């Protein structure tokens, strides 16, 4: 199956990198910035294939929601264990992935502040349309990415305990539970990339004249 | 929560001396005189386990009468630890 | 597939139960004896079906040579372990099996000796053709059966050590070997059973007159 990508462009407003707020997470939006760093084109696990460890039958086309997931269904009737799996990289399906770092434009910087950066992810055909040192307008979704950096920051960091109210227990004998941190940073996933001129306002001449009207 | 169907008037009637391996895993109607019977025993029907690491009681599983059933995953500890049968929450059927 | 059995009869000589010797093991032979005990007709594992424990694929039609065997081939490519299997009784194929105990005839008994018994196995259509208290002529193969009874008997009992001459070893550190006893008793496997009259020389009369010429 061919993987389809919808690219939106010509949004009415373009937002500054400092205008990014938490209420826009999960929303289509346009930003502009100067590309400072670009990464190698890499494969991303789109549709993985796993084999259950003791069933040893193949399953495929399991969707990946950002961080790496494993299925717990296992429609094979052989097992009674959901958690244990292994992943093969050859039968898995991949997507193109690039991380490009962008910076605040010079005129967009406030009076005394330093420029701040943002890591925006390009996938599919949008990969390698951004080059270091130019001004690019990205249209895409504001996403949120796990961040272990915020551990020492002041303020209460949200945590996530598993609720235990409908579990029957016995004190038979022979009390451990797992809690995960909810700390995140804002990133961007751009479906469309357009390169604005770095100025205020392809070697063959036949190529160049065809672009002009 | 259980209905047992009793098949009546099976046509072919076998004696005990003419049973062969072709009758294995098949329905047979035989005549005979009862000589002795055991006491009624509880047989596991809906088996409930508890994990020794966590103490939680894991949901019931139906027990096949042919073979013993076992458990390998906790769903609360995500461990293969020692699981014990507690007869207090386990459901039983009569056996003779 | 149908299981076919060949029954041989009318052997030129019939052998007494005391004429049984070790030279005739594995040979077609005829004996006569008085049936004293007969067993229930039981199923015998002819062609078993196993599943490899970690492959969990089904295999069938594995021949059984007397005592219970497990395959070591495992043509499934999933495993690298040969020894570990499990057996299911439902998919397996079985056969008629009856053990009938026979005794020396009164005229065949020597001058001061006590009568000695022999356990002969009937399979297939030959089962239930032997009845307690009659004289039967069995034609079949003289077989040999493992016997733990001979442990305290005088004389050297053959043992079976595994030979270790073509095994490379290292004294790396961190010497146990398995030996099994070869002790046996002679039994009989009869393909044909015919009941001689208990005398020296079926209720309906129509059945009886049809037998007479
Ligand atoms: Zn499985
Ligand atoms: Zn547990
Ligand atoms: Zn195997």
From Swiss-Prot, chains A, C:
Included stretch of the parent chain: 260 to 509 of 1017
Subunit text: Component of the MCM2-7 complex. The complex forms a toroidal hexameric ring with the proposed subunit order MCM2-MCM6-MCM4-MCM7-MCM3-MCM5; loaded onto DNA, forms a head-head double hexamer. Interacts with MCM10.
Compartment annotation: Nucleus
Function: Acts as a component of the MCM2-7 complex (MCM complex) which is the putative replicative helicase essential for 'once per cell cycle' DNA replication initiation and elongation in eukaryotic cells. The active ATPase sites in the MCM2-7 ring are formed through the interaction surfaces of two neighboring subunits such that a critical structure of a conserved arginine finger motif is provided in trans relative to the ATP-binding site of the Walker A box of the adjacent subunit. The six ATPase active sites, however, are likely to contribute differentially to the complex helicase activity.
Modified residues (Phosphoserine): 113
Protein species of origin: Saccharomyces cerevisiae (strain ATCC 204508 / S288c) (Baker's yeast)
Protein name: DNA replication licensing factor MCM6
Family statement drawn from the similarity comment of this UniProt entry: Belongs to the MCM family.
Other facts: Present with 13400 molecules/cell in log phase SD medium.
UniProtKB/Swiss-Prot annotation, chain B:
Ranges annotated as C4-type zinc finger: 51-77
Top-level taxonomy: Eukaryota, Fungi, Dikarya, Ascomycota, Saccharomycotina
Assigned protein family: Belongs to the MCM family.
Organism from which the protein derives: Saccharomyces cerevisiae (strain ATCC 204508 / S288c)
Coiled coil: none
Miscellaneous comment as given in the Swiss-Prot or TrEMBL entry: Present with 1690 molecules/cell in log phase SD medium. Early fractionation of eukaryotic MCM proteins yielded a variety of dimeric, trimeric and tetrameric complexes with unclear biological significance. Specifically a MCM467 subcomplex is shown to have in vitro helicase activity which is inhibited by the MCM2 subunit. The MCM2-7 hexamer is the proposed physiological active complex.
Protein name listed in UniProt: DNA replication licensing factor MCM2
Gene transcribed to yield this protein: MCM2
Function recorded in the entry: Acts as a component of the MCM2-7 complex (MCM complex) which is the putative replicative helicase essential for 'once per cell cycle' DNA replication initiation and elongation in eukaryotic cells. The active ATPase sites in the MCM2-7 ring are formed through the interaction surfaces of two neighboring subunits such that a critical structure of a conserved arginine finger motif is provided in trans relative to the ATP-binding site of the Walker A box of the adjacent subunit.
Effect on the protein upon substituting residue 74 to Y/F/S/H: Loss of activity
Subunit structure: Component of the MCM2-7 complex. The complex forms a toroidal hexameric ring with the proposed subunit order MCM2-MCM6-MCM4-MCM7-MCM3-MCM5; loaded onto DNA, forms a head-head double hexamer.
Parent-protein start and end of this portion: 291 to 386 of 868
Disulfide bonds: none
């Amino acid at each position: 199956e061919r993987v389809f990508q919808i690219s939106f462009f010509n949004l009415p407003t373009v937002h500054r990198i400092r205008d990014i707020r938490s209420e826009k997470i999960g929303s289509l939006l346009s930003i502009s910035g100067t590309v400072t760093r670009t990464s190698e084109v890499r494969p991303e696990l789109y549709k993985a294939s796993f084999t259950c460890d003791m069933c040893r039958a193949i399953v495929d086309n399991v969707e990946q929601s950002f961080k790496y997931t494993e299925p717990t269904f296992c429609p094979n009737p052989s097992c009674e264990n959901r958690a244990f799996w292994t992943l093969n990289v050859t039968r898995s399906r991949f997507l193109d992935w690039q991380k490009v770092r962008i910076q605040e434009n010079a005129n967009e910087i406030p009076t005394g502040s330093m420029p701040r950066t943002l890591d925006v992810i390009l996938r599919g055909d949008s990969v390698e349309r951004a080059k270091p040192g130019d001004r690019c307008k990205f249209t895409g979704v504001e996403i949120v990415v796990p961040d272990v950096t915020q551990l020492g920051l002041p303020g209460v960091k949200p945590s996530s305990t598993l609720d235990t109210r409908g579990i029957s227990k016995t004190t038979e004998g022979l009390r451990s539970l797992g809690v995960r941190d909810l700390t995140y940073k804002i990133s961007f996933l751009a479906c469309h990339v357009i390169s604005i001129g770095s100025n205020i306002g392809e070697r063959d001449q036949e190529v160049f004249l065809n672009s002009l009207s | 929560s259980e209905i047992h169907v009793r098949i009546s008037d099976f046509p072919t009637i076998y004696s005990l001396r003419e049973l062969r391996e072709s009758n294995l895993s098949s329905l047979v109607r035989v005549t005979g005189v009862v000589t002795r019977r055991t006491g009624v025993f509880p047989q596991l029907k809906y088996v409930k386990f508890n994990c020794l690491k966590c103490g939680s009681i894991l949901g019931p599983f139906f027990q096949d009468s042919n073979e013993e059933i076992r458990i390998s995953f906790c769903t609360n500890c995500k461990s293969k630890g020692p699981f014990r049968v507690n007869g207090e929450k386990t459901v039983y059927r009569n056996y003779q």
